[PDB]
Design a protein around this ligand. Structure first.
Ligand SMILES: CCNC(=O)Nc1nccs1
Lengths: 179, 177
């Protein structure tokens, strides 16, 4: 029961994370790169600073990782292996976290209501800042779900142990990377 | 219409995620406590003044000193939480939570939130604490902590019974208006 509810959360929240990044990319990022609206000079061609490597992060979850978590739906005790397998991909959260401070300032100092305007326009409940915190949230949440699985998975649980190891190592490295 | 960003901080043992879920669903989740509460916003009227309340969880970030602050800028009000049956969490208000919140957001209102009031009068909890030469955190302790940190209100609540829960968020909003 408990291992199953946790696995269902893992997957349900993964789907929503992919929905959320996708939304972010097809609204806030798209308007900037589209050429369909007035881009403050202060942010022009600086979408790499705003959105960091979130495209790549999205591609990873949307092309690979969600497809692979789904395969472990009936195998919660093994799902730690999913993370070991894809450990190198998570290093791209290190890059993203390094860049988030610069991203945030740039949006204060130079975007005015640009993004508030698009938010209003599309009817989005989440501000660009709310979307852009999500990778930082998500990368610290995986370790919580693995711990929860450990509280309810038997001697078959070094296939969580090492997954958890990775998902503790990634955020700490991202945390250790900040200036 | 006024938007409000609210960030909820504190130790893992406060039940941050549970608090928010229980507040937003009007129900303790019960069976399974989800570990994920995604950034939320909803309209609420306060003193008949409708408001868009935005809630951000921070659970999972409790060991990443440089990552937690990424959520801090442009926050309108903080809930700093401790559990009423964890003296350590309470002490961490002083030692961990208030410092970094002030450092980054020196003029943002703080509500001091005491959680798990449903456990302060619980024999097994109280006994488990007596065995560590400890007691639960009582009301004057929270009031004295609030004062020390500059909190606008010290408030007690339970996600379990929902006692004081709606009120926590009512006053988060009143602290901004
Ligand atoms: C099983 C103990 N009940 C709680 O979890 N109480 C809480 N009050 C606020 C947040 S969590």
């Amino acid at each position: 029961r408990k291992k199953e509810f946790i696995m269902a959360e893992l997957l349900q929240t993964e789907k929503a994370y992919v929905r959320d990044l996708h939304e972010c990319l097809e609204t806030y990022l798209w308007e900037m790169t589209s050429g369909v609206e007035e881009i403050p000079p202060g942010i022009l061609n600086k979408e790499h600073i705003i959105f960091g490597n979130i495209q790549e992060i999205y591609d990873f979850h949307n092309n690979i990782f969600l497809k692979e978590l789904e395969k472990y739906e009936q195998l919660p005790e093994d799902v730690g292996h999913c993370f070991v397998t894809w450990a190198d991909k998570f290093q791209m959260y290190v890059t993203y976290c390094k860049n988030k401070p610069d991203s945030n300032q740039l949006i204060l100092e130079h975007a005015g209501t640009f993004f508030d305007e698009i938010q209003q326009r599309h009817g989005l409940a989440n501000s660009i800042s709310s979307y852009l915190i999500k990778p930082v949230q998500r990368v610290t949440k995986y370790q919580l779900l693995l711990k929860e699985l450990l509280t309810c998975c038997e001697e078959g649980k070094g296939e969580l142990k090492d997954g958890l190891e990775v998902m503790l190592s990634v955020p700490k490295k991202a945390n250790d990377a900040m200036h | 219409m006024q938007a409000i960003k609210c960030v909820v901080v504190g130790d893992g043992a406060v039940g941050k995620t549970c608090l928010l879920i229980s507040y937003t669903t009007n129900a303790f989740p019960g069976e399974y406590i989800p570990t994920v509460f995604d950034n939320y916003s909803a309209n609420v009227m306060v003193d008949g003044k409708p408001v868009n309340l935005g809630l951000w969880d921070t659970a999972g970030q409790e060991d990443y000193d440089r990552l937690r602050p990424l959520s801090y800028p442009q926050t309108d009000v903080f809930l700093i939480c401790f559990s009423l049956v964890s003296p350590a969490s309470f002490e961490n208000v002083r030692a961990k939570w208030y410092p970094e919140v002030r450092h980054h957001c020196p003029n943002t209102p703080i509500i001091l939130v005491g959680t798990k009031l449903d456990l302060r009068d619980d024999k097994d909890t109280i006994e488990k604490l007596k065995e560590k030469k400890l007691t639960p955190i009582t009301y004057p302790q929270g009031l004295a902590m609030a004062k020390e940190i500059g909190a606008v209100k010290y408030l007690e609540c339970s996600a379990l019974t929902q006692r004081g829960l709606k009120t926590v968020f009512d006053e988060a909003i009143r602290a901004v208006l």
